């Protein structure tokens, strides 16, 4: 037998006895005792038994000579034992230590610190000393085992149920104890060739295991090597159930099975940290549990932001390595993180599954601030709950086809060559992503620009196709720090794939979906913008199809030369298509190629450009939707537009099209809408070379604050099948409120045509130039002006109304109604012309104007000019009414006209009326009434041909000043063979009554001349006159 020898008690109190060669008994009296030994050896079959007053009592055995402590037999105590040997300690096979706590250390402790319960172990070791545990070291529940040495090796089994196991290589280790247990351990100080190796079984169920190795050198040598089994099952301790700490040097190599599972509760937390962490082929860090998973951190916390975990410089996880934080029955998946600052090599399998009977999938991060190689397998699916997320995070990510990337792991790979990267760029296998989408795991890819001077920028480049042929609905998000160049398609043949190709919150790059890289979601959404963050990320799409199926499409971006630029032959199919963007110099939305946008419900185009256009559609853009809305703003340019000398813009909205902006210039367009409407707010609107047909009402509103016209229609065909066409132009400068030119046809046979033009100053209201053909049930023209004219028809126009035609307006200095060109106003029922002027005329008909109707009504007022003026020496005015014609105003002058009427009557109230060089034939009466308050004549006829086929001719002139009440001159013929001719002339002062000059032939059944005068002649016959009557001729007056 071989028991310790040379024992001497140096502090505290207790006796040493050896009752048998095979049994030693150390009896402790004090709470803390320290004894020195010449050698502390225990032979096979021998026992050293401590007898301490309590489980909290501590016996220190300091070896002061001999060699290493050969412990081969059984060592037992009811309290804590601290063994210190500067020559290291060896526990052989079959040895057993059972105490209330046990510490083995090659570092010495001072008697003053031990006796005063200050358990600090530092220095004094022999170089190369090691503690090797080949036996079974156990404690009572709540105890602890600490092995402190330059080299620590565990080949046997260590058990500290409910307590702590600490294996550490450092210059100083401080143990903070309280009431019999271990509260904390402070491990500090690098040593030369530090190594902590675990080959056997370490178990601390419901406790903690700490493995710490602090090396001074070991550039690429192993400092922490775990090849056996570490068990720390139980509750989720927030400080970590298993903690591996490789220090600030060397490589940590784990080949055994870290575990912290909880069969009935939540899984625990396993933290593996060090400079270089290598997970070998058979490793399986597992932190699972019954009611939900735990957490596994390798090299860092989530995204490296957890301040309590040292970030690794390199993490390599070889193929075959498995990390599982999945839930096993019911509960959410846990968190797994692979983090490195320089290089992450991920080829293994990480699970974070939800429970089979409930719970959501967990989250797995595989990332590196530097070079991330993500080729392995991640599974964070759920059987009943939500899909989990696989997060990738690296400087610049490139997606490649397959795994054939000359990876290094087990073939042609000498130990530790895996930490020398050659695969520049964060290559990601497309197979892994596709496998994640098919297995119910979402994928989120992030990048981030590094310091100025490097190449990596966050440019996510897709060089391999992504597809989702199977599995439940998952999301795919690619949020780059730099560019989102997509060179391959992203498709889905099953489930919903939600694609989010957003930019980083502060990104300043571009998103390009180049070379036939069509995106199809099979019902998921396509988002290539942000939402509300003002992230100046532009979108450039070339020859790409975006097919959302029954999902939504939303594109946003802001740039300088373009916001969202489309080129090539693009196609967009969705339930909702929303394109929003911004620019400063160029076009916010710029569609230059051929594009088909086919929405089931709505299409919305929104944008803003300070100096350019908001929405610019020049290529062959075809937009089909239930509702199409085009809205935008521009200060110096256009809001909307469809201009292009070769392209045609086709819009098809089954319910309504509404367009808004500062200026909308529609053109070479073909627009079909239910209720079509425009609202231009700053520089008017223009419809040129287009065809616009609507089932229901068309409402075109525009305001112009500059030289351009408000509602400008050129070569446009506007039709309303069952509704009305209403235009409302406003001009605040000198442009025209409403302006028609070219070949324009307006058809509202089932509705109304209402054109409004409100101008200001010299601006005119509604101008009709060229050739304007308007057909409707009801036609109405309304307008206002100040110095210009309100309604001015100068070209050729045809108006065909199935009921009435109404022309109304007001012009302060111009004419209210002005017809100087050639026109045929044809109405089935009534034509009414009403307006007002101050200096100009109310109605001025100058060109060849034919008005045909059942009833024609002409009315207006002019303060200084004429009320009704039908005069020109070149043109002829033709009127054709079936029923009554009434002409009422301050002054009515009719010259060079041919009027056919049922009844006809004049009512002049201020300056009388004149008919000259005209033919007027009525079936019934021609009652001409006129009052004059000036020197002008009341009723004056010059070279007039007036005939009543079946009626009478009546005139009643009044002269309140000194003008002629009634006056005839020229060649006048009055024919009333079926009636009476009655002329009344009531003058005042020096004025005469009825004056007959020239040659006046009056033919009637009865003729009567009645009048009154004061100083003048009541009847004054100065020329030639013949009065032919079949019965009586009466001449009376005073």
């Amino acid at each position, epitope marked *: 037998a071989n028991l310790p020898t040379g024992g001497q008690i140096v502090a505290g109190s207790g006796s040493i006895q050896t009752p048998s060669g095979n049994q030693m008994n150390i009896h402790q009296n004090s709470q803390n005792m320290v004894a020195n030994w010449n050698s502390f050896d225990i032979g096979k079959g021998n026992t050293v038994q401590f007898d301490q007053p309590s489980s909290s009592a501590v016996a220190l055995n300091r070896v002061v000579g001999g060699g290493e402590s050969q412990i081969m037999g059984n060592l037992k105590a009811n309290g804590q034992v601290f063994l210190v040997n500067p020559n290291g300690v060896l526990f052989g*096979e*079959g040895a057993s230590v059972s105490t209330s706590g046990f510490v083995a250390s090659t570092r010495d402790i001072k008697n003053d610190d031990f006796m005063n319960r200050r358990y600090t172990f530092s220095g004094g070791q022999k170089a190369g000393a090691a503690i090797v545990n*080949q*036996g*079974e070291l156990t404690t009572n529940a709540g105890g602890y085992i600490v092995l402190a040495a330059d080299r620590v090796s565990n*080949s*046997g*089994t260590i058990r500290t149920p409910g307590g702590k196991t600490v294996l550490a290589a450092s210059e100083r280790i401080t143990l903070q104890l309280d009431n019999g247990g271990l509260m904390s351990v402070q491990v500090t100080g690098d040593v030369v060739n530090a190594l902590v190796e*675990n*080959r*056997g*079984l370490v178990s601390a169920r419901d406790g903690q295991v700490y493995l710490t190795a602090l090396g001074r050198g070991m550039l690429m040598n192993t400092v922490l090597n775990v*090849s*056996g*089994v570490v*068990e720390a099952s139980g509750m989720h301790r927030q400080d970590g159930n298993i903690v591996l700490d490789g220090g600030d040097s060397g490589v940590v190599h784990l*080949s*055994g*099975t870290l*575990q912290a599972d909880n*069969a*009935s509760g939540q899984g625990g937390k396993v933290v593996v940290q060090g400079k270089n962490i290598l997970l070998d082929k*058979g490793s*399986n860090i*597992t932190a*699972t549990g*019954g009611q939900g998973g735990g957490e596994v951190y390798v090299g860092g916390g989530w995204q490296g932001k957890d301040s309590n975990i040292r970030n690794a410089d390199k993490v390599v996880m070889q193929g*075959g390595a*498995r990390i*599982d934080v*999945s839930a*096993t*029955q*019911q509960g959410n998946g846990g968190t797994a993180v692979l983090w490195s600052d320089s290089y992450t090599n991920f080829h293994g399998q990480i*699970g974070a*599954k939800g*429970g*089979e*009977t409930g719970g959501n999938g967990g989250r797995v991060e595989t990332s590196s601030h530097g070079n991330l190689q993500a080729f392995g397998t991640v599974s964070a699916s759920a059987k009943k709950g939500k899909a989990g997320n696989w997060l990738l995070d690296s400087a610049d990510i490139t997606i490649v086809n397959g795994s054939n990337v000359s990876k290094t792991e087990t073939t042609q790979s000498p130990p530790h060559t895996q930490f020398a990267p050659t695969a520049a760029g964060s290559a990601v296998s497309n197979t892994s992503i596709n496998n994640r989408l098919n297995n119910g795991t979402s994928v989120t890819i992030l990048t981030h620009r590094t310091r100025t001077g490097t190449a990596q920028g966050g440019n996510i480049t897709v060089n391999a196709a992504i597809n989702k042929g199977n599995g439940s609905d998952v999301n795919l998000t690619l949020q780059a720090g730099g560019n989102i160049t997509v060179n391959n398609s992203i498709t889905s043949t099953e489930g919903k794939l939600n694609v989010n190709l957003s930019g980083a919150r502060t990104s300043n790059g571009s998103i390009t979906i180049s070379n036939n890289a069509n995106i199809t979601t099979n019902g998921g959404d396509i988002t290539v913008g942000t939402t509300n963050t003002s992230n100046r990320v532009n979108i450039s799409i070339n020859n790409t199809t975006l097919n959302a199926s029954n999902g939504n499409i939303q594109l946003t971006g802001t740039g300088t030369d373009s916001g969202i630029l489309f080129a090539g032959n693009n196609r967009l199919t969705a339930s909702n298509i929303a394109l929003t963007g911004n620019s400063t110099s160029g076009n916010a939305i710029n569609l230059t190629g051929t594009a088909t946008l086919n929405a089931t419900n709505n299409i919305t185009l929104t944008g803003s450009s300070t100096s350019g256009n908001a929405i610019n559609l020049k290529g062959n853009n075809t937009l089909t939707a239930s509702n199409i809305t085009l809205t935008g703003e521009s200060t110096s340019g256009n809001a909307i537009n469809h201009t292009d000398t070769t392209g045609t813009t086709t819009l098809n909205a089954t319910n309504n099209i509404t367009m808004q902006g500062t200026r909308v210039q529609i053109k070479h367009s073909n627009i079909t809408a239910g209720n079509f409407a425009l609202n231009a707010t700053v520089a008017g609107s223009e419809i040129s070379n287009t065809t616009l047909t609507a089932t229901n009402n068309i409402n075109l509103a525009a305001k112009t604050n500059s030289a351009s016209s408000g509602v400008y229609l050129k070569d446009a065909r506007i039709t309303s099948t069952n509704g009305s066409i209403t235009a409302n132009g406003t001009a605040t400068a000198n442009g025209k409120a409403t302006h028609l030119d070219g070949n324009v046809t307006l058809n509202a046979s089932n509705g109304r045509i209402k054109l409004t033009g409100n101008g200001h100053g010299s601006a005119s209201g509604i101008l009709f130039a060229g050739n304007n053909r308007l057909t409707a049930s009801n036609i109405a023209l309304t307008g206002n002006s100040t110095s210009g004219n309100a309604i001015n028809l100068t070209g050729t126009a045809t108006l065909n109304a199935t009921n009435d035609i109404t022309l109304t307006g007001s012009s302060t200095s111009g004419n209210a109604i002005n017809l100087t060109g050639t026109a045929t106003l044809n109405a089935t029922n009534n034509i009414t012309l009403t307006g007002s002027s101050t200096s100009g005329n109310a109605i001025n008909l100058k060109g060849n104007n034919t008005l045909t109707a059942s009833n024609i009504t002409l009315t207006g007022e002019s303060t200084s000019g004429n009320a009704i003026n039908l005069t020109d020496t070149t043109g002829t005015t033709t009127l054709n009414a079936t029923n009554n014609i009434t002409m009422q105003g301050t002054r009515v002058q009719i010259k060079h006209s041919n009027i056919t009427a049922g009844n006809f009557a004049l009512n002049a109230t201020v300056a009388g009326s004149e008919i000259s060089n005209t033919t007027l034939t009525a079936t019934n009466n021609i009652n001409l009434a006129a009052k004059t308050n000036s020197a002008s004549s009341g009723v004056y006829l010059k070279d007039a041909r007036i005939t009543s086929t079946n009626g009478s001719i009546t005139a009643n002139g009044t002269a309140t000043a000194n003008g002629k009440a009634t006056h005839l001159d020229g060649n006048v013929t009055l024919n009333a063979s079926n009636g009476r001719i009655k002329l009344t002339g009531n003058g005042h002062g020096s004025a005469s009554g009825i004056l007959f000059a020239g040659n006046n032939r009056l033919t009637a059944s009865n003729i009567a001349l009645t009048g009154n005068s004061t100083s003048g002649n009541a009847i004054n016959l100065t020329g030639t006159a013949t009065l032919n009557a079949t019965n009586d001729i009466t001449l009376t007056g005073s």
Partner: antibody, heavy 116, light 106 residues
Framework: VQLQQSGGELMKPGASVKLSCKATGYTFTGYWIEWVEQRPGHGLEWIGEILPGSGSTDYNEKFKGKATCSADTSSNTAYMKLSSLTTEDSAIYYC??????????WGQGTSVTVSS | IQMTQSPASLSVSVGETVTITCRASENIYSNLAWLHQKQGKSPQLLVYGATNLADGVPSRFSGSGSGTQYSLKINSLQSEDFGTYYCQQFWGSPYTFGGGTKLEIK
């Protein structure tokens, strides 16, 4: 990782045997080597477990006393002794490396036949 | 803890997906492994920890189950998949085994 086993044996009733299962390609002391009996009409039954490093063992209650498990860590091989074998103890005995989850890499098994 | 599995023997077609079930006499917290013993070979591990497959096992095998009721689903069964499958629990000391199920060619 490989777990080769000794070949079969023919034994007389009442004899004891000590079998063999070489462990290679992994840390021998870090995994448990579990011995399982396979018989026609019974399939597989667990026999016992040894942790070669510390020498800790665990046995099926029906096999206590009859079987003893041990290991030589220096030679990286696993031994099992079966005492007082009878006719009804003829079986194929497998050794396997067991990690916390699943007795992986089973060996080929030793056919132990007991007859007069 | 007793383990029962069924069917004891299944006659299946090549290319058919089949299910093997296993029931524990006590609640086993997912610590159920499945072994595959090809005729003439020692049993190999296919799925460990109820659902996690072992490396080298084709994706056609899928484990499932919880509580006391577990099963193994074999998609598009191939010729190499015939033989005897076993379930075993590590939640009890006797790491008991089921009686095994055999797949034979129909």
């Amino acid at each position: 990782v490989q777990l080769q086993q000794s070949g079969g044996e023919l034994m007389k009733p009442g004899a004891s045997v000590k079998l063999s299962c070489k462990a290679t390609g992994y840390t021998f002391t870090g995994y448990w080597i579990e011995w399982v009996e396979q018989r026609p009409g019974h399939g597989l039954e667990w026999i016992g477990e040894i942790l070669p490093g510390s020498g800790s063992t665990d046995y099926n209650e029906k096999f206590k006393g009859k079987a003893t498990c041990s290991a030589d860590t220096s030679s990286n091989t696993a031994y099992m002794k079966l005492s007082s074998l009878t006719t009804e103890d003829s079986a194929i005995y497998y050794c396997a490396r067991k990690s916390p989850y699943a007795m992986e890499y089973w060996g080929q098994g030793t056919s132990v036949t007991v007859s007069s | 803890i007793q383990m029962t599995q069924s069917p004891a023997s299944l006659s299946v077609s090549v290319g058919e997906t089949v299910t093997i079930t296993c029931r524990a006499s006590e609640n086993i917290y997912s610590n159920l492994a499945w072994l595959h013993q090809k005729q003439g070979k020692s049993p190999q591990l296919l799925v460990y920890g109820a659902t996690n497959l072992a490396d080298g096992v084709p994706s056609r095998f899928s484990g499932s189950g919880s509580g006391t009721q577990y099963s193994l689903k074999i998609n598009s069964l191939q010729s190499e998949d015939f033989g005897t499958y076993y379930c075993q629990q590590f939640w009890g000391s006797p790491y008991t085994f089921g009686g095994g199920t055999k797949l034979e060619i129909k």
